[PDB]
Amino acid sequence: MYTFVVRDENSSVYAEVSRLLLATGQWKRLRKDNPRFNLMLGERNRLPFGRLGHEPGLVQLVNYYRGADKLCRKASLVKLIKTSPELSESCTWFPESYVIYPTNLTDEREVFLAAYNRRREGREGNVWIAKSSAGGILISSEASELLDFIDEQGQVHVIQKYLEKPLLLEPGHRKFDIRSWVLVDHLYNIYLYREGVLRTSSEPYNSANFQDKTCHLTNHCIQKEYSKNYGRYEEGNEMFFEEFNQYLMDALNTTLENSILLQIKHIIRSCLMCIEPAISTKHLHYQSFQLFGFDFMVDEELKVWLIEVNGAPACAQKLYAELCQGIVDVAISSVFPLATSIFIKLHHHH
Amino acid sequence: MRECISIHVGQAGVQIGNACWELYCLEHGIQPDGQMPSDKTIGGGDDSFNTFFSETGAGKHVPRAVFVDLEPTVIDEVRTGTYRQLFHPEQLITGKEDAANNYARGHYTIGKEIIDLVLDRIRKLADQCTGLQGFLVFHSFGGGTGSGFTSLLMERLSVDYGKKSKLEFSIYPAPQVSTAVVEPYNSILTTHTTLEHSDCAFMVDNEAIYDICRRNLDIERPTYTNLNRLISQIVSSITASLRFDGALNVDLTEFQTNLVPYPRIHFPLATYAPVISAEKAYHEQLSVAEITNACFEPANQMVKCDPRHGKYMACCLLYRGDVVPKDVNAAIATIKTKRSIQFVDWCPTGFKVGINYQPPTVVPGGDLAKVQRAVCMLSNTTAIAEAWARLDHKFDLMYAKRAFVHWYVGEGMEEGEFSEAREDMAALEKDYEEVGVD
Amino acid sequence: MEVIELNKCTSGQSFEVILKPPSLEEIQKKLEAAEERRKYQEAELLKHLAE
Amino acid sequence: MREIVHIQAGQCGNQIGAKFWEVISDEHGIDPTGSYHGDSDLQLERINVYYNEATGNKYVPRAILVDLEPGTMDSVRSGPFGQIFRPDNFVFGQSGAGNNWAKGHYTEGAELVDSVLDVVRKESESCDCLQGFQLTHSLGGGTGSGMGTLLISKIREEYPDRIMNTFSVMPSPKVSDTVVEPYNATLSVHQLVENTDETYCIDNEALYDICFRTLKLTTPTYGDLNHLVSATMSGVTTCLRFPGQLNADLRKLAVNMVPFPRLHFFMPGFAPLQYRALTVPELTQQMFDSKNMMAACDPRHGRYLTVAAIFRGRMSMKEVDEQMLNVQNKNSSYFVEWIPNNVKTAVCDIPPRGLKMSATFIGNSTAIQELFKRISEQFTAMFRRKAFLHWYTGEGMDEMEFTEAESNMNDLVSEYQQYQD
Ligand SMILES: Nc1nc2c(ncn2[C@@H]2O[C@H](COP(=O)(O)OP(=O)(O)OP(=O)(O)O)[C@@H](O)[C@H]2O)c(=O)[nH]1
Ligand SMILES: Nc1ncnc2c1ncn2[C@@H]1O[C@H](COP(=O)(O)OP(=O)(O)CP(=O)(O)O)[C@@H](O)[C@H]1O
Ligand SMILES: Nc1nc2c(ncn2[C@@H]2O[C@H](COP(=O)(O)OP(=O)(O)O)[C@@H](O)[C@H]2O)c(=O)[nH]1
Ligand SMILES: Cc1cc(C(=O)Nc2ccn(C)n2)on1
Ligand SMILES: Cc1cc(C(=O)Nc2ccn(C)n2)on1
Ligand SMILES: [Ca+2]
Ligand SMILES: [Ca+2]
Ligand SMILES: [Mg+2]
Ligand SMILES: [Mg+2]
Ligand SMILES: [Mg+2]
């Protein structure tokens, strides 16, 4: 009888995993503080990694990788890419980004300003965006408004180049982002969930007005609140891979695999492979796995850009059942076996 | 030459001390009857090994050690074991009833009755020391004597030997090789009262020593013999600088200078390699680069933690055998570009390297294979604070219900001393958090 | 990769490699106060037994 | 040299104490004449804990037989092993106790107790370092119950820093001698709460169930019930009588087993309970089973504060851990979570006589309150009508003392009640 605990009472994903475990009759759930567990579904913040793997006779597995926040924090990702050689500062698939601390508190203000001045000095597009992990986003083309917006906040803010030429879905002349659910098992095998979702914008894109952020931010919550065309084109502003792969063919004479998925798969490998020697639990006294939520941007040239990596992502309503079961099959049963894979293994060198 | 006095308290301390002095005699060529054919200074001399061994006119080489326990069973083994001819009966001190895994019993009730006899026996060893460096205190955390009597002895040694260093070799409680439930209390109680009296403490988690025995030595269910035969290898690596010629860690003070920049954070993490099963007829000999890189695999740490999520304040590489500086520096570079070695800002990023040419000595008919080169890495990492977290947590689970508290209050200790010690451990964790986290 | 303080002898050598520079009176009052609490504890155990 | 002083009081106490000395004498290789004929040093390594060393290399049990009538100790002396006991350590009267706690505690027992303490004092004085005392007795009778607790009451006054443990046989209507057994047991329990470090609860009802159902014994006798008690007592003392990493003294065992001073009543269990070898998975699954326990309390109704398991014989300690873990995971919700690692395992190389391997269970469970609840209900059933009280008030007892014992028992049930939620 395998045992597990539930310490994050908000994870919609692992609330389904928990239910699936009990459905096997071979998993017993304990109290959130019982130390005799095989698998821990830990809390988001301040997860007590230092107490894992110290129970005699118990193999213990946790649904998080200690140190993966370096990839899932706004400022942390930019610093990780700029400092990491595997990614380098000339990283082609990450928008130009600078870490800006509020003045009431290293800082890249001057570096960003020189980059800004060089653009305006050359007539180039100069639309930037300011955002932070505690969000509160601002789209502006004036280096002043963006910097002053950050000084009005008390946490670390990031400013990156705003993609002014995004791929627009027709009809609608609208924007969108791609969400790819990734899973890294205890062996560090990088599995990409075959199914993704495009969180679409129900408002036409207007490059001459960045103040109305409803046609520029493709967040599912922004569209369902301030956008008045929600669910018009697709249900819940969610376009799934089968339909979007069909639009890319009829509209652009290409496929989701060639035009986008190849880069999405390459960007996932490059990031996870970069932080392997720091978060891997190969010879560790406990095992880690984790489900990541990658967010991509696609410009009009069919170039994929990484926006951010989410370490605690939800899931599309239509995809919970399929994805949660795969987590149990690749991430859990692989360690605690019972009595066509929905993923795509991204081969790499450990 | 300055001397070192070894003090072994309780069953854990005493049995570990038995394995260490065995290895010391083998390493220095000292026969079980205390003779040393190579020593040409008969009854005297100020050589490196004389820091751990005095000499009688009869040429016998007597360890500078005291064994103390509250029950006689474990010390009686030494009185008749193989090396019974090394120790004088005065160096072996025993009571009649132990501390029953009760710190209060070992510190107050029974301890107060034997403390002055131990100090007198220690003073007698000091009287033979022209320049005493200090003491090495071997003991367990979870025992009633190793925890309760050690801290009392440590309090007293500070008063009588103020200017003397005191290093600890502590056994951290692992539930798989122990049959107690009050060990969280005893550990925090003794760590609380011993912190300001120990200049440097090398903890060894039985859980880590145990897994090494199962994994590398292929021992299904290891015994204390297997555990201590390995612990002695590590202890030998750490004290070899004091018993042989050299320039690194030449006296007990240099241990603090090179490993402990902050007085409270004096718990260096030990990492040893290689550990090869002797049953293996032929095992390939690892290179400086291969053993050096093993000092960063968790499975070779005396305490299981993750240095990738801590900050180093110091790091020592103690090599034994066929190791040349050229190959060490080379491997040190290869490990910076591939390893997460994040020092603290107010400290240089470097390594103090010591090389002794004599390879690790193996005990005849033991568990360890004969290797051509070994290394012990002492590093002061904030990841060892994981060990305090585990311990403090267990302490908190019992102390919330006051479970077992009556056994301690009943032996004179006050209940306030519990939370007083716990508040200190909390401050100790808080100090580790400041130095290694941003 | 600087090597400092290279000390060599017959049984070995040591050095340091730097990669990057930095960016009684009261002891009896507690042993006696606990002995008086044991005396007082057994003083109530005997008086209890006298009743 | 950690000597234990053994004391058996009354009929049940002396009969249970007799089989005990009969059993461990065989384990240590001591014949009924005190001569050692064993073949292992493990038998003599820690033999001095229950046996004195006499002239001619004889081994005399450090035991003291007490009773208020001569019948039972005539049997012990006339028995085969009876010749092993010290002739001077037989201390008995002639009046009998009449299955009356008052006669054992206040009147007849009061007249004899001082002489018993002279024999105890004679044994203690020749002790290099006394661990403490163990008493075998029943709680439903008059001598072992009334005088047994009176003995303990005076041993603590004279040995306040020694361990005082008892093997207390609890009465059951299923195996009852008289209707006043609830009175005698209620009066003894309160004494046990105040003056014993550990009390092993041996319920005759659970012993009858074990003999009847599991052991398939039609009409169980007292000797049938005692064979189990012998096997259990041999087990819960293995960590004492034998050397190795498991050797400890009473105090150390109590320190790790008793988290609260008054909740020191243990549930013992044994296994196996026909020539079929018992695979490690079989020993361990019964050892935690209620049908294998000797306190007639359902573990699933309370919660475990501490638990010990002594495995005797030769087997794979690796297989034990795996099966032990499986038992813990199936009953995870029953062990308190605020005592880390509260289930320990020990091994002894010497198996009991004629068994490849056995398992002895020692549980500190809050389910033990069922036992005290039965006693309490039975007590009140008679006391509400004041039935049979004249046997006690004739010995100089008052009703008030019964009311106080009823309250003290209930308070005990409530104290166990808090630590179960
Ligand atoms: N590594 C190692 N650990 C040991 C050894 N002996 C005991 N221990 C550990 O020490 C702890 C028990 O404390 P002891 O040292 O046996 O107790 P003590 O110091 O003699 O004090 P008392 O309670 O009075 O006996 C347990 O956690 C054991 O696992 C040993 O020989 N080697
Ligand atoms: N550099 C950039 N260029 C174009 N659009 C951008 C952008 N940075 C952010 N966006 C827009 O912002 C939205 C996502 O913002 P971001 O992901 O930083 O906030 P967030 O982290 O709170 C959402 P989530 O964490 O759920 O993915 C996307 O829909 C995208 O359209
Ligand atoms: N298990 C067991 N119980 C007994 C034995 N003898 C008596 N009893 C129980 O003890 C109670 C009677 O007490 P008893 O020992 O005869 O009183 P005493 O001799 O005056 O101390 C009854 O509840 C009996 O069931 C015995 O040999 N074995
Ligand atoms: C005589 C005697 C023995 C004990 C006792 O508690 N023994 C224990 C406890 C745990 N184990 C393994 N053995 O009490 N009276
Ligand atoms: C609960 C629980 C049970 C025990 C136990 O039997 N402890 C033993 C047995 C032998 N020694 C030396 N210690 O400790 N905690
Ligand atoms: Ca000071
Ligand atoms: Ca009379
Ligand atoms: Mg947001
Ligand atoms: Mg001991
Ligand atoms: Mg009778």
PDB file of C-alpha atoms in Angstrom, chain B residues 108-109 112 245-248 325 329 332 336 345 347-357 409-412, chain C residues 1 3 7 9-24 27 30-31 34-35 37-38 41:
ATOM      1  CA  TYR B 108      22.833  16.284  36.665  1.00  0.00           C
ATOM      2  CA  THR B 109      22.033  13.157  38.709  1.00  0.00           C
ATOM      3  CA  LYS B 112      27.569  15.281  39.086  1.00  0.00           C
ATOM      4  CA  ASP B 245      54.516  16.158   9.465  1.00  0.00           C
ATOM      5  CA  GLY B 246      52.943  18.924   7.425  1.00  0.00           C
ATOM      6  CA  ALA B 247      51.815  22.535   7.428  1.00  0.00           C
ATOM      7  CA  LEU B 248      48.003  22.398   7.090  1.00  0.00           C
ATOM      8  CA  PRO B 325      49.560  19.228  -6.490  1.00  0.00           C
ATOM      9  CA  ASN B 329      44.805  22.082  -9.139  1.00  0.00           C
ATOM     10  CA  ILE B 332      39.854  21.771  -8.928  1.00  0.00           C
ATOM     11  CA  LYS B 336      34.337  24.741 -10.807  1.00  0.00           C
ATOM     12  CA  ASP B 345      30.637  37.132  -0.767  1.00  0.00           C
ATOM     13  CA  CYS B 347      34.953  34.963   1.613  1.00  0.00           C
ATOM     14  CA  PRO B 348      37.430  34.053  -1.139  1.00  0.00           C
ATOM     15  CA  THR B 349      36.544  31.237  -3.526  1.00  0.00           C
ATOM     16  CA  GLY B 350      39.347  28.764  -2.946  1.00  0.00           C
ATOM     17  CA  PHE B 351      40.496  25.507  -1.401  1.00  0.00           C
ATOM     18  CA  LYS B 352      43.092  24.722   1.246  1.00  0.00           C
ATOM     19  CA  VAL B 353      44.813  21.543   0.058  1.00  0.00           C
ATOM     20  CA  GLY B 354      46.783  19.095   2.179  1.00  0.00           C
ATOM     21  CA  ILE B 355      48.574  16.049   0.795  1.00  0.00           C
ATOM     22  CA  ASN B 356      49.992  13.218   2.901  1.00  0.00           C
ATOM     23  CA  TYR B 357      51.742  10.564   0.842  1.00  0.00           C
ATOM     24  CA  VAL B 409      12.017  17.026  35.157  1.00  0.00           C
ATOM     25  CA  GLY B 410      12.129  14.042  37.510  1.00  0.00           C
ATOM     26  CA  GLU B 411      15.937  14.042  37.316  1.00  0.00           C
ATOM     27  CA  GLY B 412      16.341  17.658  38.478  1.00  0.00           C
TER      28      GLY B 412
ATOM     29  CA  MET C   1      44.062  30.106 -10.504  1.00  0.00           C
ATOM     30  CA  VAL C   3      48.656  29.003  -5.703  1.00  0.00           C
ATOM     31  CA  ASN C   7      54.575  24.235   2.065  1.00  0.00           C
ATOM     32  CA  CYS C   9      57.973  18.392   3.586  1.00  0.00           C
ATOM     33  CA  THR C  10      58.975  14.726   3.408  1.00  0.00           C
ATOM     34  CA  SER C  11      55.571  13.137   4.143  1.00  0.00           C
ATOM     35  CA  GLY C  12      53.571  15.433   1.857  1.00  0.00           C
ATOM     36  CA  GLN C  13      52.809  19.058   1.068  1.00  0.00           C
ATOM     37  CA  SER C  14      50.016  21.610   1.358  1.00  0.00           C
ATOM     38  CA  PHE C  15      48.961  24.849  -0.308  1.00  0.00           C
ATOM     39  CA  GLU C  16      45.946  27.027  -1.070  1.00  0.00           C
ATOM     40  CA  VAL C  17      44.362  27.593  -4.480  1.00  0.00           C
ATOM     41  CA  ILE C  18      42.267  30.745  -4.940  1.00  0.00           C
ATOM     42  CA  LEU C  19      39.844  30.963  -7.869  1.00  0.00           C
ATOM     43  CA  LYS C  20      38.052  34.279  -7.233  1.00  0.00           C
ATOM     44  CA  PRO C  21      38.580  36.958  -4.562  1.00  0.00           C
ATOM     45  CA  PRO C  22      35.856  37.991  -2.102  1.00  0.00           C
ATOM     46  CA  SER C  23      33.158  40.255  -3.520  1.00  0.00           C
ATOM     47  CA  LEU C  24      32.230  28.112  38.500  1.00  0.00           C
ATOM     48  CA  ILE C  27      27.627  26.063  37.790  1.00  0.00           C
ATOM     49  CA  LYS C  30      22.188  25.023  38.826  1.00  0.00           C
ATOM     50  CA  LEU C  31      23.423  21.584  39.907  1.00  0.00           C
ATOM     51  CA  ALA C  34      18.044  20.840  40.604  1.00  0.00           C
ATOM     52  CA  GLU C  35      19.181  18.705  43.547  1.00  0.00           C
ATOM     53  CA  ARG C  37      13.993  20.119  43.365  1.00  0.00           C
ATOM     54  CA  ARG C  38      14.654  16.373  43.547  1.00  0.00           C
ATOM     55  CA  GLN C  41      10.018  16.011  44.877  1.00  0.00           C
TER      56      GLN C  41
END
